[PDB]
């Protein structure tokens, strides 16, 4: 069927929880074993979130080459994203150790560190120009170049340097800072202006890295976020934009990692967002 008017279908029969648990028995079932190897327990925030061994990033590093992350792949559409967890105390370095060897422009952060009155992922980049970090671990350190907060998101100029090679690299941090603690946004509108601004950085474009993306376990908004890009992109592609299938866009994504999208409401949302969004792109 039809985007809109499939929406509007299971808006009236009321089968939103029904139509995602069958998202979640069909969905890919692949091995996790190096994220469940003793040694790796304080690299994983979640005991049941862990990304797939034939998908998963390496660090370039011979002790342990662990991180918790994910590199989804998507051919038709031609666009890569690595969807990682918020970043721990003792994990900060693996992050921008990870950045720098995947050759990443941007980062997207889609939720606080803290929510609900709970730390969701550590301060891992600097709040003032005159203090910088060191990450010693990794050999890097990260400035804060410059700031623009806006009423929906934050964006930042860092700049990274490889203490080894002494290169240096500027990453962009674009941060959405409004989304509710509990629940969804009512409306797609400012997500879906964070995610234009995103791409008319560069950030998503074939001559970079994969961009970066997480929230605190990197499934549910992230799943969001690129889910809404990936459709949009395909419906603009294709001689037939009503051939793009959220649910088996959806079911590919999770081929490459566990449990996107966490709820039917999330799942309703990004319908919603695609739905507002390819109305915007055209023609108008
Ligand atoms: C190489 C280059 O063009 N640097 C430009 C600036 C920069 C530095 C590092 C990260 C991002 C931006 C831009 C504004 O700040 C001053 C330097």
Redesign the pocket.
Same mark, same amino acid.
């Given at each position: 069927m039809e985007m809109e008017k499939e929406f509007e279908q299971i808006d009236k029969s009321g089968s939103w929880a029904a139509i995602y648990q069958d998202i979640r028995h069909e969905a890919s079932d692949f091995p996790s074993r190096v994220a469940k190897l003793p040694k790796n327990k304080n690299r994983n925030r979640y005991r049941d979130v862990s990304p797939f061994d034939h998908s998963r990033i390496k660090l370039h590093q011979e002790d342990n080459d662990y991180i918790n992350a994910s590199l989804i792949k998507m051919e038709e559409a031609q666009r890569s994203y690595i969807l990682t967890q918020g970043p721990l105390p003792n994990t900060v370095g693996h992050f921008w150790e990870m950045v720098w060897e995947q050759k990443s422009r941007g980062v997207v952060m889609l939720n606080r560190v803290m929510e609900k009155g709970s730390l969701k992922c550590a301060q891992y980049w600097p709040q003032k120009e005159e203090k910088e970090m060191i990450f010693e671990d990794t050999n890097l350190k990260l *400035?804060l170049?410059?700031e623009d907060i806006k009423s929906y998101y934050t964006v930042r100029?860092?700049?990274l340097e490889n203490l080894t090679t002494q290169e *240096?690299?500027?990453?962009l941090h674009f941060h959405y800072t409004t989304w509710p603690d509990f629940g969804v946004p009512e409306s797609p509108a400012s997500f879906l202006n964070f995610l234009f601004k995103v791409r008319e950085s560069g950030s998503l474009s074939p001559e970079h890295g994969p961009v970066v993306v997480h929230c605190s376990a990197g499934i549910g908004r992230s799943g969001t976020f690129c889910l809404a890009d990936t459709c949009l992109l395909l419906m603009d592609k294709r001689k037939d934009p009503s051939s793009v299938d959220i649910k088996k866009v959806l079911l590919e994504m999770r081929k490459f990692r566990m449990g996107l999208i966490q709820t039917a409401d999330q799942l309703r949302f990004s319908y919603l967002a695609v739905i507002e969004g390819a109305k915007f792109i055209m023609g108008d």
């Open positions: *400035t170049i410059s100029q860092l700049e *240096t690299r500027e990453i």
